[PDB]
Amino acid sequence: NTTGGRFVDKDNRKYYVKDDHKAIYWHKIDGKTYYFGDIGEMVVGWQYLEIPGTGYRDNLFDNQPVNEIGLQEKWYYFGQDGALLEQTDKQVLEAKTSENTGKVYGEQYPLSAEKRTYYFDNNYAVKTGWIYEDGNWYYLNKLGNFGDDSYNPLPIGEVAKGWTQDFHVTIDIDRSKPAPWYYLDASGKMLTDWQKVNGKWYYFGSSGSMATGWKYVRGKWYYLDNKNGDMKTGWQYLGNKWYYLRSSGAMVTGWYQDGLTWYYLNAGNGDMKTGWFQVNGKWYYAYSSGALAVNTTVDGYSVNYNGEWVQ
Numbered sequence: 001n002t003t004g005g006r007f008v009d010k011d012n013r014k015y016y017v018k019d020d021h022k023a024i025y026w027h028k029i030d031g032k033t034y035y036f037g038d039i040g041e042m043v044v045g046w047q048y049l050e051i052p053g054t055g056y057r058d059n060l061f062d063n064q065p066v067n068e069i070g071l072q073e074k075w076y077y078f079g080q081d082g083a084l085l086e087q088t089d090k091q092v093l094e095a096k097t098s099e100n101t102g103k104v105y106g107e108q109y110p111l112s113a114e115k116r117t118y119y120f121d122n123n124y125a126v127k128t129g130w131i132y133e134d135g136n137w138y139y140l141n142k143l144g145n146f147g148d149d150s151y152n153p154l155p156i157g158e159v160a161k162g163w164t165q166d167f168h169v170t171i172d173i174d175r176s177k178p179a180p181w182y183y184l185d186a187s188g189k190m191l192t193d194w195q196k197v198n199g200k201w202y203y204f205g206s207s208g209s210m211a212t213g214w215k216y217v218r219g220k221w222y223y224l225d226n227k228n229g230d231m232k233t234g235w236q237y238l239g240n241k242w243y244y245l246r247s248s249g250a251m252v253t254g255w256y257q258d259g260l261t262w263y264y265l266n267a268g269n270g271d272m273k274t275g276w277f278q279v280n281g282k283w284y285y286a287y288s289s290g291a292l293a294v295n296t297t298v299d300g301y302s303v304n305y306n307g308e309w310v311q
């Protein structure tokens with residue numbers, strides 16, 4: 001807690017001077033918190049700053065050495081008086097834009113008439129990640145917009161919409177950890193179970209993560225694209241074996257007739273069978289294409305209209 005000082009207005013800026021030295025970075029002054037930057041100019045409004053509390057950026061004055069430290073940056077909101085908004089739940093505030101962030105006391109900037117509901121963590125920074133609100137899950141952006149060299153932290157903390165990947169993020173993305181896919185609706189609601197997006201079907205389960213590969217959902221087997229997740233139908237060559245999935249996407253087992261041709265999908269895994277196989281005591285022969293032989297001979301041996309072997 002900083003004491004023995006005084007706020008001073010000068011040069012269309014504001015400072016906190018004690019013993020004739022300017023205050024810098026974070027300071028607790030009389031039950032309130034302020035951030036005076038690198039040269040002492042008090043900040044107002046939306047600010048993207050290193051997290052306070054470590055002491056490496058706290059209770060410092062312009063006459064002391066500033067230490068090298070690797071601290072994560074986060075969004076904070078200060079009032080027009082310079083006092084930090086110590087909110088830990090939610091609050092409606094002016095939207096974060098390209099022209100109301102990083103301003104100092106004295107600097108006049110347009111007030112965004114657009115107001116948004118921002119959420120805060122227990123340390124007064126804008127919350128990121130998942131949040132539950134009225135029986136639904138929303139995702140607040142963990143990362144800004146990336147570029148070849150450009151990074152815009154402005155979207156951090158905003159309600160995500162559409163296809164969104166959830167990364168493990170501290171200061172940078174952790175590419176060693178998984179990053180599932182989610183879809184937030186036109187109001188940010190996380191989608192669950194089966195959903196049709198852009199004409200194709202996707203399964204999000206009960207947790208919301210997009211499914212990939214084979215998935216057993218309510219007694220049926222489905223195949224979601226191994227990478228893009230969209231549901232497959234019809235004949236599919238997966239794992240060097242053949243499978244037929246209905247228009248509903250449900251895998252087919254047993255006998256199936258495509259037009260006039262008969263195929264047999266193995267009972268267990270539904271893989272198409274070839275060559276000689278036996279169903280309920282009787283024998284059948286299926287060509288390389290999986291098509292069943294009917295009313296013909298196979299190596300001299302005869303099969304009737306049902307494909308059954310007739311001694």
Ligand SMILES: C[N+](C)(C)CCO
Nearest residue numbers: 130131137190207208
């Ligand atoms: C992703 N949710 C927040 C919906 C559940 C935690 O896995």
Ligand SMILES: C[N+](C)(C)CCO
Nearest residue numbers: 163181210227228229
């Ligand atoms: C649906 N995904 C976003 C997972 C892939 C399409 O780009």
Ligand SMILES: C[N+](C)(C)CCO
Nearest residue numbers: 194201231247248249
């Ligand atoms: C399971 N789906 C919703 C994808 C199809 C139902 O016919």
Ligand SMILES: C[N+](C)(C)CCO
Nearest residue numbers: 214221251268269270
């Ligand atoms: C996932 N299936 C069971 C459908 C095939 C693998 O055995």
Ligand SMILES: C[N+](C)(C)CCO
Nearest residue numbers: 235242258272289290
């Ligand atoms: C079973 N195949 C997919 C090989 C042919 C039927 O279209």
Ligand SMILES: C[N+](C)(C)CCO
Nearest residue numbers: 255262292305306307
């Ligand atoms: C074996 N088939 C399915 C082709 C006919 C049974 O009656």
